[PDB]
Ligand binder design. Structure first.
Ligand SMILES: [Zn+2]
Ligand SMILES: [Zn+2]
Ligand SMILES: [Zn+2]
Ligand SMILES: [Zn+2]
Lengths: 48, 65, 645, 147, 648
RNA sequence: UCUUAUUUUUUUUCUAUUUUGCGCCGACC
DNA sequence: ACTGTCTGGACTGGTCGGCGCTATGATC
DNA sequence: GATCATATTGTCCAGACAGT
């Protein structure tokens, strides 16, 4: 918010970032998987 | 207080040093070493590094600052 | 180094028991900062009259603090009742706090004059009847968050503050009155340049730092943003911990910006002597600087805990109070007149050996807000002077017609129903504009409200908390009369963005005092954006405008300024409101003012060092003073040492 | 004489060693030697004829957890009882972390190192302006070797 | 020594790469290292290097460093075979005296009477010697007059070759710890000798290096340590000494005011590192320190330092020649130019940055061509700041010309020695005594006198050093030494006395002679003995050439008092009638007067931006600075002690 | 009677807008 | 190729209400 | 007295595995 910009720290990619609506429980599950040394890669798809 | 000698590196509670008979005492010291036997290997290692240390059973040190 | 503090304390106790009556019961005599603290068991016989205390202070040359011994102490729940009964009800006491570790009672009251006493006898009577050494502080009529935070920090950290004060007193009096073999002045910054000022007074015994600051303009270049840390003398002083004290001339980023940086990396652990208004304004400005540095995306210079440590290591000195800050160096502060708490630093080295007067930022003409700068000293040998407006053609217009033009522009703007937006600094010109507006509205000229936004309310509250540091007219109005110029009902403060939006949408005429002259941040940008399309409004600039900023762009006559709006799209500001530039409210001394200060200073200094300004301006001012008065003038660069004696 | 390890509470190895020394003095134990280096935290070394004497000597002390089954060769602890300054092995240009002092928990880079005054000079990497500071040689720890 | 960043690995790698790409692979380069300001290259086959003389010059120009090519220790001829080969190769007229070998670096030291024949034209012999010996040679001059000081210094250097080599390697590593660096700021601070005479001390401080210049002691106020010693309480000096950041020390000339405090640092281990100077300055300053500690020991006061720290100073001394540019710091280049004050007196030229700034510290110097020393070099490649002495900067400081003083001395000798008297000329061992005896020898060259001249005291050592270093003398003396077969210092009229028997015999003989003994202002030595034993004689005249300090025997004699109370050994006081004749000719002084200083300021090239006047009285310095500012318009300053002036 | 070192101009403000977890017990559908 | 044995995992959901716990032996 | 590092390491069903 201070910089006002969205970027991927592991990768860079200051341009190709998309907003995804999902449950906060799913975000917590992804955080748990990352803490368990598991990398979930979300392959985004167009809504149409 | 707790003080350690600078010559023989002995740890004593009172002012007098009853092992080497010197009048230099340091309030800062680390590496407490306990000697119980004359022939013990760490006592021999202390002797070759500090010729005036590890002569009698007690407390000693390698470096004094 | 060797310390003779024990022998000095023993001889001081011997002198006391020779002079002070035996029945007083002297138990302990110690050093707290630059003052001498004596603990007694029978304060009734100690201070039957103030003549004995005055004689003791004159003989010992110490700030005598007589406190009851902690062996006897009245209970706080009863001591509060006795203090309330003893203090007249006219002085509205707001808070009473007790320090039992060292017997002290802090009385935060709205009228400290009645609590302190006609000649200080009320404090003696209170500490006689209740057995608690009193310290009176002023309750500000306008509540201030920074002052309350500073007081809470000083109260909750009484143990650390007392230990620091005791160690400072032990370090100061390590030896008796010492005649220095040599005195040297070194400039680590602010020499032939503007900003990042830093002065070093060096003797064979003690070293003193003066107004350590930062350079906002050259913040992109670390070499020019900060005072030179590669100076061998400064490296030696900081490395061996020989810095006896730090003195801040006035609260500004070029004079106090780099102060918390030393405490961030534990490079300094001594005291910082400054006036209370300077201390509070310096913490406010440092907090603001850290906030905008953290917003801009760059790494902040220091954490707020470093500012808290600076507060814990700050010693408050009033105007005209002489204190021993080093075994050969005495320090006093005089009214500079630039901003609130601005102090000209007079350093007396030796017993008449040398005297240095560092003016810093100051004003010589009598302004409405502050008294004129003090041009009289008991002794003066070296004078370090600012050269911000030292050029030959640098002639600021007089204040009278400048304020007349401002008043008439405001009147014409409000006649057509427009809104007046006045961008200004956080301190300095803003409060002067408030005073001018209050004087204009007191006679019935304008009845519209005046809105103060963006930390100007905090500066106004700090100004209210210290009225004795203001001008003679304001002091007369506040103390002798029952009217406070800052407490006018026209002055209003916002609470959130909703109140600002209500003010903007309001159709009635109003005057808005913004927070940023450049219109870079704060509510100034929002007010400019939401009031520019209306042609009835007007904007008045009271400060210089920097290139590349919104303020300079709108001052240059740009009728359409493209800016980055929301959604990442360029939105234009159609500026149809009137633009005015009245730069006659600057708090810096004019070239004529500097010449008058040089001509009217008493006694005439042996040498004058022109600093705090551009190199050409400094050289021109030094040459002009040398040609006019014949005084030896020097304008050295950075890392230049001058041997005064 | 065989070297064995006794695990103790961190920060009070010297107190446990002194307690074991007092127990050996007042209880006639066949203990040959006891060593407690300051650098090693939470463990002490005991030179004894057998591990049984070690576990008997440490028995009864709540601050002595256990005795490791293995036997430490003397070459492993030979360097412990050697006269060598803590500033040795530190070269300028690397990065160190300051364990104690006013700069506790700070990373810096070594600029000047001398062994006569048992001190080292480090410049803080987090400081925007380079200001060297002096710190005791035993107060730093090497994190990455570089010139 | 202190430990620094030491980025010399990359610089050495680049130097090795350039050498490989330039020097042919047949040479077989093995090692490249730095010894002080010198670059040392060890190669497997030196038989493919000096076949063209331009290769070494081109390599030195490309690398911008002095190159000393030495063979590897593996390829080393036996010392006897190498010595006999060197002796047979050189012409017999070279007269090689001593040959010393250092197999650690494979370096031969050849002390010879005529170094020019050994070196040859453009070093063509010096390289070719290696082509038959496979040893790196270095030639020094054996003086015609045997010198104890030079021989002792050479023996100390040869016996301590390992420690000297280690110290040189450490100094070379410290010098090239960074590449070509431009300093952000340059300042100069006067720890001593500023607005005062004696105990001079200059400190040039940059953001990377700190250089000390002309560190000395004051003997006028030796009872007070504050007024006699340089300011050790200066924060910059304390920071430099505590952290060991003093990169180099340069001595302007050999004097107590410029080299007295040098052994004090080594006695207390305050500073260790290189001391850059000229060989005559080093030898004469060692002699001066030796006599200073002898005086302190005989006076009953505690000596300032022992001879061991003097030997340490000798072991930590790097000798440079006139006009030689050397790297003493990552940003500072040091050059020494002729000064003309005394033998080995060097004007210091510090070039800081890549043309960023240039400082010229003249110190004591002379501009008129003296009979023994060449005039000071008034031309420099670049000049921005000039530091010059102001000992005679007063308005009335206009000395008579040297011709008048020489005529007065010659006529005084003529009217005194025709009556059978013995002229006594007390003078300093390093100062104007050499000029006096040169004038006497020139007068004796005509044939108008045949009397002997006795060099009692330490004048013999100074004359031996002068003979050993004739290239530092004037153009006329250098011509007469090199391109003509006669030595003015080797005149048979010059005699040396070793003990008291010969001096007593020549005192009691009554034959006319000229005695030149050193005692300062008759504070102690052979001169006071000569005066006491020649006081009843009325046919001889004493000559005073230097200033006489108040309260001394020389001032009492100059005042014309006929009853001089002189204390004696074993109690009591030796008070006798004095029939001595007193003359005062203050024209042989090696200090430039006001006119010479103004001429040097006018004729200096290029004109400096600022001129700093030091090494003189406060009023004299202020008057000289004001006169220069009024005449030429240059911004002149006369700072006091502990004053830092930022240059750039 | 003698070697191997170099030398110079283009970046700006004194500051800012609704307590989890663990475990137990009981009851209801 | 069969056969008994060792190891691992799950044990319907939801709700109302309560009870109770989440530092301490040295150190100046 | 007020602080401070450390604080231990019931059954049943199904899949995999030595043994004969
Ligand atoms: Zn990515
Ligand atoms: Zn001992
Ligand atoms: Zn300022
Ligand atoms: Zn001199």
């Amino acid at each position: 918010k201070r910089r006002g910009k969205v970027y991927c720290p592991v990768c860079g990619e200051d341009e190709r970032i998309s907003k995804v609506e999902m449950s906060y429980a799913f975000k917590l599950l992804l955080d748990e998987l990352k803490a368990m040394v598991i990398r979930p890669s979300l392959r985004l798809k167009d809504r149409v | 207080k707790e003080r350690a000698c600078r010559h023989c590196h002995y740890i004593t509670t009172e002012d007098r040093c009853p092992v080497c008979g010197s009048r230099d005492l340091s309030d800062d010291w680390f590496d407490l070493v306990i000697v119980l036997d004359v022939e013990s290997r760490i006592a021999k290692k202390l002797r070759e590094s500090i010729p005036e240390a590890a002569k009698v059973p007690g407390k000693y040190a390698i470096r004094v600052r | 180094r060797e310390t003779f503090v024990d022998d000095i304390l023993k001889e001081i106790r011997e002198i006391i028991v020779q002079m002070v009556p035996r029945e007083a019961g002297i138990t302990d005599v110690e050093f707290e900062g630059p003052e001498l603290v004596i603990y007694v068991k029978n304060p009734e016989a100690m201070m039957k009259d103030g003549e004995l205390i005055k004689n003791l202070a004159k003989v010992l040359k110490k700030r005598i603090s007589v406190r009851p011994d902690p062996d006897i102490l009245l209970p706080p729940e009863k001591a509060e009742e006795l203090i309330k009964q003893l203090v007249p009800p006219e002085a509205e006491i707001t808070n009473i706090s007790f320090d039992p570790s060292v017997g002290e009672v802090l009385i935060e009251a709205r009228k400290p004059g009645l609590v302190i006493g006609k000649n200080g006898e009320t404090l003696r009577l209170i500490t006689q009847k209740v057995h608690w050494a009193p310290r009176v502080v002023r309750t500000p009529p306008i509540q201030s968050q920074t002052i309350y935070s500073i007081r809470s920090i000083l109260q909750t950290e009484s143990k650390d503050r007392r230990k620091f004060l005791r160690q400072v007193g032990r370090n100061i009096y390590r030896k008796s009155e010492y005649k220095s073999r040599w005195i040297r002045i070194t400039g680590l910054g602010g020499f032939r340049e503007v900003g990042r000022s830093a002065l070093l007074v060096q003797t064979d015994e003690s070293y003193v730092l003066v107004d350590f600051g930062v350079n906002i303009a050259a913040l992109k270049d670390p070499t020019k943003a900060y005072p030179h840390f590669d100076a061998p003398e400064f490296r030696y002083v900081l490395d061996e911990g020989l810095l006896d004290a730090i003195i801040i001339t006035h609260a500004a980023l070029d004079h106090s910006g780099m102060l918390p940086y030393l405490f961030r990396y534990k490079l300094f652990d001594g005291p910082i002597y400054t006036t209370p208004p300077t201390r509070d304004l310096m913490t406010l400005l440092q907090q603001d600087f850290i906030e905008i540095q953290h917003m801009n995306g760059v790494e902040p210079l220091y954490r707020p805990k470093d500012i808290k440590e600076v507060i814990k290591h700050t010693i408050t000195l009033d105007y005209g109070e002489v204190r021993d800050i080093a075994p050969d160096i005495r320090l006093t502060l005089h009214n500079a007149g630039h901003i609130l708490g601005s102090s000209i630093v007079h350093l007396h080295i030796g017993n008449g050996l040398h005297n240095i007067a560092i003016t810093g930022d100051f004003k010589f003409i009598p302004t409405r807000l502050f008294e004129p700068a003090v041009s009289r000293f008991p002794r003066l040998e070296t004078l370090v002077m600012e050269s911000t407006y030292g050029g030959s053609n640098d002639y600021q217009m007089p204040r009278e017609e400048a304020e007349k033009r401002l008043i008439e522009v405001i009147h014409q703007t409000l006649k057509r129903g427009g809104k007046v937006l006045i961008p200004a600094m956080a301190v300095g010109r803003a409060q002067e504009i408030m005073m001018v507006l209050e004087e204009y509205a007191r006679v019935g000229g304008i009845e519209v409200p005046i809105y103060l936004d963006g930390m100007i309310w905090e500066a106004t509250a700090i100004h209210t908390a210290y009225p004795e540091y203001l001008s003679k007219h304001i002091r007369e109005q506040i103390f002798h009369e029952g009217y406070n110029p800052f407490l006018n009902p026209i002055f209003k403060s916002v609470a959130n963005s909703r109140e600002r939006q209500d003010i903007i949408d309001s159709g009635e005429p109003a005057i808005i005092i913004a927070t940023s002259g450049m219109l870079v941040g704060g509510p100034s940008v929002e007010y400019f954006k939401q009031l520019a399309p209306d042609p009835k409004n007007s904007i008045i600039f009271v400060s210089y405008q920097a290139e590349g900023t919104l303020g300079r762009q709108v001052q240059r006559g740009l009728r359409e300024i493209p800016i980055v709006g929301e959604d990442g799209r360029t939105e234009v500001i159609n500026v149809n409101m009137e633009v005015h530039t009245i730069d006659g409210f600057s708090g810096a001394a004019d070239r004529r003012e500097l010449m008058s200060y040089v001509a009217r200073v008493r006694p005439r200094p042996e040498r004058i060092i022109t600093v705090h300004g551009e190199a050409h301006k400094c050289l021109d001012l030094s040459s002009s003073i040398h040609k006019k008065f014949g005084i030896s003038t020097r304008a050295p660069n950075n890392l230049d040492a001058i041997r005064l004696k | 004489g065989k070297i064995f390890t006794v695990s103790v509470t961190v920060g009070q190895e010297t107190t446990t060693a002194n307690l074991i020394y007092s127990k050996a003095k007042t209880y006639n134990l066949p203990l040959y030697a006891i060593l407690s280096p300051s650098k090693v935290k939470g463990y002490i070394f005991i030179e004894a004829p057998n591990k049984s004497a070690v576990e008997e000597a440490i028995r009864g002390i709540r601050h002595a957890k256990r005795v490791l089954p293995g036997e430490i060769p003397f070459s492993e602890i030979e360097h412990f009882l050697e006269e060598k300054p803590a500033v040795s092995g530190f070269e300028p240009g690397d990065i160190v972390e300051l364990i104690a002092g006013p700069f506790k928990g700070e990373k810096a880079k070594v600029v000047r190192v001398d062994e006569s005054k048992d001190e080292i000079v480090v410049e803080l990497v987090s400081s925007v302006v380079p200001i060297p500071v002096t710190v005791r040689g035993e107060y730093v720890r090497l994190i990455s070797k570089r010139q």
